[PDB]
Amino acid sequence: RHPPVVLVPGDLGNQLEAKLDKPTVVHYLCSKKTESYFTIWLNLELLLPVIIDCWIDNIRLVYNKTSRATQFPDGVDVRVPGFGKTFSLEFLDPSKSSVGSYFHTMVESLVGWGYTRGEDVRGAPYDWRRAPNENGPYFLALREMIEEMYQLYGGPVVLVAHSMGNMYTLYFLQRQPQAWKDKYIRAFVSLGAPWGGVAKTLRVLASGDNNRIPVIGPLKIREQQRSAVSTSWLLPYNYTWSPEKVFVQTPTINYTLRDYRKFFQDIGFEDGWLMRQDTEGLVEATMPPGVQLHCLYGTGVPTPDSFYYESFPDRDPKICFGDGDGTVNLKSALQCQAWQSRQEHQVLLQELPGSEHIEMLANATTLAYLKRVLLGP
Numbered sequence: 001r002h003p004p005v006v007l008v009p010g011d012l013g014n015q016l017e018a019k020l021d022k023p024t025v026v027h028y029l030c031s032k033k034t035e036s037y038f039t040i041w042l043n044l045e046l047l048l049p050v051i052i053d054c055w056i057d058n059i060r061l062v063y064n065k066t067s068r069a070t071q072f073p074d075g076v077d078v079r080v081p082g083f084g085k086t087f088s089l090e091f092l093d094p095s096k097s098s099v100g101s102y103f104h105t106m107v108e109s110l111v112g113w114g115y116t117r118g119e120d121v122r123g124a125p126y127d128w129r130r131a132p133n134e135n136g137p138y139f140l141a142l143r144e145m146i147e148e149m150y151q152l153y154g155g156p157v158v159l160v161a162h163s164m165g166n167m168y169t170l171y172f173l174q175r176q177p178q179a180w181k182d183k184y185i186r187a188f189v190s191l192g193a194p195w196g197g198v199a200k201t202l203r204v205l206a207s208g209d210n211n212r213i214p215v216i217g218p219l220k221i222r223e224q225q226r227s228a229v230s231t232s233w234l235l236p237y238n239y240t241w242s243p244e245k246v247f248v249q250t251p252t253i254n255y256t257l258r259d260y261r262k263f264f265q266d267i268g269f270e271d272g273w274l275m276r277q278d279t280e281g282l283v284e285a286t287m288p289p290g291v292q293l294h295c296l297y298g299t300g301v302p303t304p305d306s307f308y309y310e311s312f313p314d315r316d317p318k319i320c321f322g323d324g325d326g327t328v329n330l331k332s333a334l335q336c337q338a339w340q341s342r343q344e345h346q347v348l349l350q351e352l353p354g355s356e357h358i359e360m361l362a363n364a365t366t367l368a369y370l371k372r373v374l375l376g377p
């Protein structure tokens with residue numbers, strides 16, 4: 001026998017669909033209207049030059065300074081398919097191409113161990129463009145799904161979260177009563193958690209990140225990346241990083257985590273500061289999840305730590321690297337150790353040397369660890 005499993009993805013980590021009835025478009029070749037939803041992430045054909053402007057216009061969030069909230073562009077809806085199922089987190093591209101293969105290797109393994117897609121293993125995908133403050137309905141659905149799985153399969157559930165999904169899961173758990181967690185949660189397996197933010201968010205917001213895909217201009221994709229509240233939510237936090245650490249250096253100014261207001265002014269994106277204020281307090285830095293926790297973190301992969309700009313903000317910086325998994329800085333991942341003394345439930349730390357941030361989900365060592373958590377001694 002084996003416990004039910006809920007999978008929580010990270011940023012970019014599940015499909016998104018859009019349906020359009022737009023008053024205006026940025027190019028004539030952009031569709032104003034669709035009769036049904038289509039996949040907006042991940043579909044590679046939408047990211048090609050010129051067409052990418054259509055995509056940005058649909059997938060960007062609009063920040064409303066009055067409500068301090070995001071909304072979709074006029075005539076655009078974006079929905080999250082596959083809640084309670086696994087397809088939309090197994091493959092980011094519904095063509096099922098390897099370029100989008102995310103949770104697929106892990107789900108294959110789980111199924112080989114006796115799990116059933118959509119039944120005792122289920123996904124909890126979400127609109128990862130937002131931070132928890134704008135995903136209230138998702139947390140209600142997550143709570144309900146956990147309760148359902150407990151009742152159906154006769155025991156508490158194991159939460160398995162990747163990257164930003166860990167922060168989503170921690171937010172969720174911090175807000176549930178201890179008695180609820182003791183009944184319904186068996187364990188939380190935390191894979192590549194950026195507990196105190198990731199340093200690369202500074203570069204993304206300042207100058208864009210096209211991830212070495214040269215056919216996408218970094219200044220073009222920067223528009224989308226800035227619009228996503230989740231980007232500013234993942235700026236480094238002072239419970240992980242020194243308030244005096246410089247993340248961004250230019251010829252005339254430094255930026256530390258105490259300098260985000262100046263940073264956002266200086267990059268010409270004042271809304272980002274508002275988004276940071278909206279989101280920075282959502283997860284209490286020092287409250288442990290209050291459940292058995294397995295913190296798995298990659299090391300031995302150069303991980304961007306800080307950025308030097310000769311020309312700010314519209315040129316790519318020089319990058320300084322620290323330890324981590326390529327994305328999540330080792331320091332961030334290690335916030336986990338502080339929780340050992342702050343909850344009664346066990347906190348187990350597991351280093352994964354040489355395990356890159358995304359590859360850790362398909363890695364035999366990761367899967368062997370998960371198997372031990374699920375299937376026992």
Ligand SMILES: *[C@@H]1O[C@H](CO)[C@@H](O)[C@H](O)[C@H]1NC(C)=O
Pocket residue numbers: 064065066067
């Ligand atoms: C911003 O939201 C407020 C209501 O909260 C409203 O005044 C206004 O319609 C919104 N702005 C836009 C452009 O939708």
Ligand SMILES: *[C@@H]1O[C@H](CO)[C@@H](O)[C@H](O)[C@H]1NC(C)=O
Pocket residue numbers: 246249250251252253254
């Ligand atoms: C920023 O910090 C470095 C030390 O980390 C220093 O050498 C430099 O003078 C600082 N830059 C500015 C513009 O104050």
Ligand SMILES: *[C@@H]1O[C@H](CO)[C@@H](O)[C@H](O)[C@H]1NC(C)=O
Pocket residue numbers: 238239243280281
């Ligand atoms: C640490 O972080 C929050 C903002 O995220 C701030 O309000 C708090 O006062 C900071 N404390 C420091 C630097 O002592």
Ligand SMILES: *[C@@H]1O[C@H](CO)[C@@H](O)[C@H](O)[C@H]1NC(C)=O
Pocket residue numbers: 351352353354355356359363364365366
């Ligand atoms: C899988 O992760 C292990 C444990 O860290 C690591 O040693 C090994 O490099 C990884 N294998 C691959 C192909 O990345």
